[PDB]
Amino acid sequence: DNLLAAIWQDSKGFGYATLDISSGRFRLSEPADRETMAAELQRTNPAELLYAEDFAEMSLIEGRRGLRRRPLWEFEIDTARQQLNLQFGTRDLVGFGVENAPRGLCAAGCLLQYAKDTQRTTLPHIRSITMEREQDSIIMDAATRRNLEITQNLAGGAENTLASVLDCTVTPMGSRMLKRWLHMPVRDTRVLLERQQTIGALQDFTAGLQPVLRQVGDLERILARLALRTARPRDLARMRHAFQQLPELRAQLETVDSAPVQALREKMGEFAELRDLLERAIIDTPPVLVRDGGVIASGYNEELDEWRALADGDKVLTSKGKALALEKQLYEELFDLLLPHLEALQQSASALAELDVLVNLAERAYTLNYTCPTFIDKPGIRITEGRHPVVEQVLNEPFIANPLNLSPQRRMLIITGPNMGGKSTYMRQTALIALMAYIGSYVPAQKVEIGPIDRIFTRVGAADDLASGRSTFMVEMTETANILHNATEYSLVLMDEIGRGTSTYDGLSLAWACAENLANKIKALTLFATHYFELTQLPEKMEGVANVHLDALEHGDTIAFMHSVQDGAASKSYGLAVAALAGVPKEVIKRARQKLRELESI
Amino acid sequence: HTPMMQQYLRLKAQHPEILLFYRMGDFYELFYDDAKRASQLLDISLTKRGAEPIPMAGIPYHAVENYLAKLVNQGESVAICEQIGVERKVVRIVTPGTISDEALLQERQDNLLAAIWQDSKGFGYATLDISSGRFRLSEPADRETMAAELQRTNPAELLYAEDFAEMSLIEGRRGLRRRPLWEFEIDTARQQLNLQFGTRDLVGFGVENAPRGLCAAGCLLQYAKDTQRTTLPHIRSITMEREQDSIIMDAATRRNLEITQNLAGGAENTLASVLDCTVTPMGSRMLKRWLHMPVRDTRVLLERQQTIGALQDFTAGLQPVLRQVGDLERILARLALRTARPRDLARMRHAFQQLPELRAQLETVDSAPVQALREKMGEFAELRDLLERAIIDTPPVLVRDGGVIASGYNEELDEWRALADGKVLTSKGKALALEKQLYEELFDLLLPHLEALQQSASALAELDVLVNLAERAYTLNYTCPTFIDKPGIRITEGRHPVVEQVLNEPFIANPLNLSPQRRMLIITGPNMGGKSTYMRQTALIALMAYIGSYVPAQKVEIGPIDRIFTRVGAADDLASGRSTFMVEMTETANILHNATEYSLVLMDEIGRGTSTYDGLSLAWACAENLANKIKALTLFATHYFELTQLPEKMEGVANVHLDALEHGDTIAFMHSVQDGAASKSYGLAVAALAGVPKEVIKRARQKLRELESIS
Ligand SMILES: Nc1ncnc2c1ncn2[C@@H]1O[C@H](COP(=O)(O)OP(=O)(O)NP(=O)(O)O)[C@@H](O)[C@H]1O
Ligand SMILES: Nc1ncnc2c1ncn2[C@@H]1O[C@H](COP(=O)(O)OP(=O)(O)NP(=O)(O)O)[C@@H](O)[C@H]1O
């Protein structure tokens, strides 16, 4: 095991660290539950452990191999961050991906000092610090989500995003569930296979189910208000309308014969007794607030009916007061009867929302020509006639579908092409198709075979935060470092250009070394967009690397782009022709061509 | 079917596309299509009542303001109907553009109702702030100029004619309202505008000879009168904004220089955050407006610099007094619309009590600008006397609650109230009615002085911004700039305003000299050496100099700057059909077509996003066009060291280089600008500092030796 470990506790949560003497592997965790920390302690099974002198719960580490105690001064975050930065030779640890874990870094600082004391031999072999996560959801960094425009576009607007194309859900609860599914894509095949079977099964009956689902409305807010006992009289009537709607939905789903569809039908429930209580107890159109009165319906309580009669044909005003008090007590009693079934109702609201998201996904699939994706065991992506989900909808002109094949035999493709050729659209189409397959939706391609994807990494933007202290090359190099350090054989790494900030020679050199490292050692599935044609000579030298070229045809001054992926290198990017289309003055384009001839000639 | 439903339907017909909060009982309610739209936006339950079921949703009257805020933020216009006599009418229409209420509005942000009109000969844009009363007219003559005006103004509600041809810049904006073509006619606009200002002709304003702008202003004034359902006494002028009056900045330059919003989208680490420590909200909004539109009129700037110098010694005494005055401009707007609440009048009384202290402090300091502000603010002795006698020291939030009028303002009101406390229902009822009637009379007494009070609110806001800039100048060590007749920028010990404050490490100041003799400087330097900060410090110093503020440098001499152009970074908009090279090239084309000898052009790493030969060739041609033909003052940052030889070929171009020292394969950055050129970018060293794995950097260094050996 050869594993040295550290543990920390504070108000925010628990922090943990691991260091392997044999492999120089340094990792940190921030498990926020006592039980999770206990499971993590067993799963790590560390040879030695270090804990705070004032650790609150020693029971988690009560019996451990070579358990030891070190002082609080060693655990301080500011001292720990400086030592870690110096050991790795980095200004900040944002590149390693561990900068935002305060508790994890504090435990790591104690382990680094202890590790140096126990052996100075391992110290030169410690070069990185990474978080530990085998989370079911595919891991996506904040930058990848904004770059892929999963829910919010780069400007910050709701439109032109993947969620805008797929979010036509009838009910507000459904729209929230789809957005949550897009942000966390489940990697377990069994849950996705159940969702895909429901989407195909309910495809025929989407028109019958959606009107009834729209009537149900948002039940999540009504049920949460019921839990705090602040539900309005009108909100209880809304719940009664959904109870009346549930028999209709169940009858429609009964004809369908899919095990996932039938399970969702049972979870929805009928709640006939709750419907009977609400119908008898509440008037057809109840008032906005319970204070005025008239919420309770006659026949729910005999005494109330009698007091109401006395109130309406000064002593009579006292009888009116008695009636209002009896009514309010009956209303509080109504919450008491409904609340025992609150856990059951919460399961039903989730079941109704899942039906809305899946019925919506099925309608979107028929309208937009999507097809089911078939999962495979080894890490590879194959797409035939693939299209970008967002671009196809917003583009008046036709979309030209491009094929993709990635396997452990052909892991890296260097896409080279003319400017405005479609290289970035092709790389993003792979990322959105992989995420759409992994949420259980139907992919926008004729056929897709998607293998396990641990994490999706997107390096596209080049921006500088001067106040933060990082230039455009440092911001780009920080993202490249996170790709190289945190990448796995399963990861899909999409890199849109590298060395766009430095001189041509330094940039080509980093691009050549980063491309070699991703194919040779990381062995991740990589798509690399490049305007350096020197890198198109990499595929012959290194195995697993192939060249993909987008096609353009030049006639006179103007250029036409095919948008078609073919094998080859391109070797010419028509930058000056794209500049003239952008509107650069003719005299500037003419001078530029004259200089271009001189540079190539010598 | 029912008579009640028939009445709602007649009102709905008058206002078809806007949600109507019809008032039935103590609960505002919406019916039919409005009820469904309201339920989705306000999160209120929808219950159907048979007359043909009628969807009905309802909100309590006490909680109406909270619900109105949710719809106003979403951009919905909500007409509110109340039963005046049951006879009923739309008392007011609440729209994102024209909200004067405290809860609906944001304290340090301004909501502008704007109008766009496209005639065959160019575009006309008119903007009105209902609360401040400012009315500004413009005639943008290009699609690019119109887009810059829309982004800078950021209109809350934009009113566009149905026939507007270029519905591309307009599309995607907040609160878009389609208006009929008849509303934009010039003859109708001129008669309405002349009546509001009370002037026979608009020659005095100077807006008489602009036809397209006047058409947009006529629609804006008519919509504002209809939305508020009352005459707007606050609007009394129609100033015209011209391109010559202010330094022009495109939407991209405003974002790149981070004047008010950072590149991510937050307000943190922005020039406004460093310079804005204003005590009153009016000051915060005024300073933000000045930074967005710098003035090119030397007389206006020299007065602002003189005021900052005169009040610098007395800033500590003035700032506590100014804080008490608060947001007078918004309070006066509510008084003008006769919609004010008791707390607002108490805040007005507090500000008048502070004015004697401000007048005495300003009287001692001797400068022509400070004395003019002192004269404009005034004393308002009569109004303070009325407010102190009429209103209680701590009035209730609403007039109906009662207790708004203090004892002794009216003997009869005091007698009726005393009898009720000591028929009791009749005395209480009469007292509540009399207290409300007295409150309306107070508005009538305060309103004839509105013209003077509005002048005072502008003076107090100007003093707040100038005192804040003077306090900031002392704390951050800023010094006054001077102006020169011919185009040039000379800076000694200049430092970037935002980076200097945020960075704990010491800022190393740098000098810049740009003249017609040295029009262009090509900055070549080690990566992470400070080139972008050097270029942005020049733009921020030039903007700060032209807003009348002291500059962050030991000495600055700045000549006329027509426009500031910044090409920084690269971006992709796949949905729009714009590639990263296309977005960069359109920005480069805008600089080449629109640049003038007066303009300052800052360009960062132009020619990237394409092959090296195509990028260097386009960069050489663009540099040669800017230096030789446009002759603009420009700063160009390049890692292409081939472009470093431009000065030998062409006169008026010089090379400046930031420098770094390499030690043991590690990099130390001097951050000092020294004349000359740098032939090494130190890219591999910055990558190692970033955290690129050591094995990758070692292979990269091997490849770099091989590439340099090949050539
Ligand atoms: N497969 C496609 N079919 C149809 N249109 C496409 C396709 N791919 C791209 N386009 C269109 O062409 C535009 C340019 O593609 P894009 O990927 O942005 O080019 P680019 O190669 O990234 N340019 P650059 O980054 O400067 O090298 C897109 O915004 C689409 O409008
Ligand atoms: N004069 C200065 N004094 C101190 N620090 C400075 C100075 N100028 C820049 N910096 C620091 O430099 C960093 C950003 O450097 P930047 O201006 O982006 O360099 P650059 O040369 O443009 N980078 P690149 O575009 O990749 O070549 C920030 O941490 C600044 O605080």
Ligand SMILES: [Mg+2]
């Ligand atoms: Mg691209």
Ligand SMILES: [Mg+2]
């Ligand atoms: Mg830079």
